[PDB]
Amino acid sequence: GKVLDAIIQEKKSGRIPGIYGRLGDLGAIDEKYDIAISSCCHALDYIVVDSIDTAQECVNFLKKHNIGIATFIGLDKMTVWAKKMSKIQTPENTPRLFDLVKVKNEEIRQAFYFALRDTLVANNLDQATRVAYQRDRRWRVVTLQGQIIEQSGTMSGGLEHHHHHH
Amino acid sequence: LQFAYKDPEKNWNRNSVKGLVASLINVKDNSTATALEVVAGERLYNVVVDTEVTAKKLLEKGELKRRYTIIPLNKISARCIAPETLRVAQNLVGPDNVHVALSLVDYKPELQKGMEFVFGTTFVCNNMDNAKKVAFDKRIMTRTVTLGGDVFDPH
C-alpha cells in the first residue's frame, strides 16, 4: 500500500538508512504454505528496520507527510530470540511454520521467530484439533486451508472458497 | 441477526450451537453498554458452541456465509483477571471505580467459560485517569476500558 511504498522510497533513495522492508518480503516459503502463513501472521506486514531510532524516524516521516501508520520491528530488539529458535517436539511431529521459512540473514531469522513463534501448521482441521488441544500445552495451529486454532481455543474458518478471489 | 448455518450432518442437535456472543448476554445496567461493546469488540460476533467437534463440523460443512471465529465451551481457556489483581486495582482507584467486565453482564451459567474469555480479561473503569492508573500499574498490566469507551492497553 501507500505506506509501504513511501517507506521503500526512503530506503531506496538512502534518505533513511537502516530500512530492510516488509518482513514477509525478507524470507521465502514453499507455496504449499502460502494460505497458512498469510492467514495466521499479520506480523508479516510489519516493517523491519535496524534500530528503534530508525523506527521512530520512519514513524515521524509518515506522520509529517499525512501518509499513515505502520508497525515496525527493530532488529536491535530481536536479539532476545538468538538462543530460542531450536526445534522442539511437536504433536504428531507437525511442522512449525517458523522452521519452514527460508532466510539467509540470521538477524532477520530472529524477526521471523518473533512473528511466528511456535505456531504449527496442520494438514486439515481434523489434525489441527488433535494437535492444538494437548493436555500439557495449547498450541497455536493453522491449517493448510488457513483455518486457525488460537491458544485460547477458538477455532476460525469459513468461506475458504473465496481465498483466491481476484 | 442470528447465526445461520446448514446442518453439517443428519440428526443435528441444534442445542449444540448457542449463537452469537451478542445474543447471549444481558447487560446489568444500560449505562455500561458502551464500555462492554468496546471490551468485546469483534468478539460480539464470535459464535459459541458446545464442543470443538461441533465447531469443526460447522466450519467444514455448515456452508457458513463468512469467516467465523467459534468459541467451543469445552476447550475455551481464558487467561482471566485473578482475584488478587482485582484486589490491587480496587485499592488503587477505589472499588466503585474498577470492575472486571464480566461482573457487568448476566448470561446462562452454561456459558461461563465463553464469557470469561470475552469479558473476564478486561477491566472497566469510571474514567480515563483511573483507567490509566489501573492498566499500567506494574502489578496489574491489564487492558482497561472506560465507561466512555476509551481503551488503555499496556500491550
Swiss-Prot record, chain A:
Function as written in the Swiss-Prot or TrEMBL entry: Central component of the condensin complex, a complex required for conversion of interphase chromatin into mitotic-like condense chromosomes. The condensin complex probably introduces positive supercoils into relaxed DNA in the presence of type I topoisomerases and converts nicked DNA into positive knotted forms in the presence of type II topoisomerases.
Gene name, Swiss-Prot/TrEMBL: Smc4
Family membership: Belongs to the SMC family. SMC4 subfamily.
Location in the cell: Nucleus; Cytoplasm; Chromosome
Assembly behavior: Forms a heterodimer with SMC2. Component of the condensin complex, which contains the SMC2 and SMC4 heterodimer, and three non SMC subunits that probably regulate the complex: BRRN1/CAPH, CNAP1/CAPD2 and CAPG.
Domain SMC hinge residues, every copy: 17-131
Organism (species): Mus musculus (Mouse)
Name of protein: Structural maintenance of chromosomes protein 4
Sites of N6-acetyllysine modification: 83
Domain notes: The SMC hinge domain, which separates the large intramolecular coiled coil regions, allows the heterodimerization with SMC2, forming a V-shaped heterodimer.
From Swiss-Prot, chain B:
Assembly: Forms a heterodimer with SMC4. Component of the condensin complex, which contains the SMC2 and SMC4 heterodimer, and three non SMC subunits that probably regulate the complex: BRRN1/CAPH, CNAP1/CAPD2 and CAPG.
Domain SMC hinge residue range list: 16-135
Organism of derivation: Mus musculus
Domain remark text: The SMC hinge domain, which separates the large intramolecular coiled coil regions, allows the heterodimerization with SMC4, forming a V-shaped heterodimer.
Family membership noted in the UniProt record: Belongs to the SMC family. SMC2 subfamily.
Superkingdom classification of source: Eukaryota
Protein name: Structural maintenance of chromosomes protein 2
Localisation: Nucleus; Cytoplasm; Chromosome
Function: Central component of the condensin complex, a complex required for conversion of interphase chromatin into mitotic-like condense chromosomes. The condensin complex probably introduces positive supercoils into relaxed DNA in the presence of type I topoisomerases and converts nicked DNA into positive knotted forms in the presence of type II topoisomerases.
Span covered, complete protein: 506 to 660 of 1191
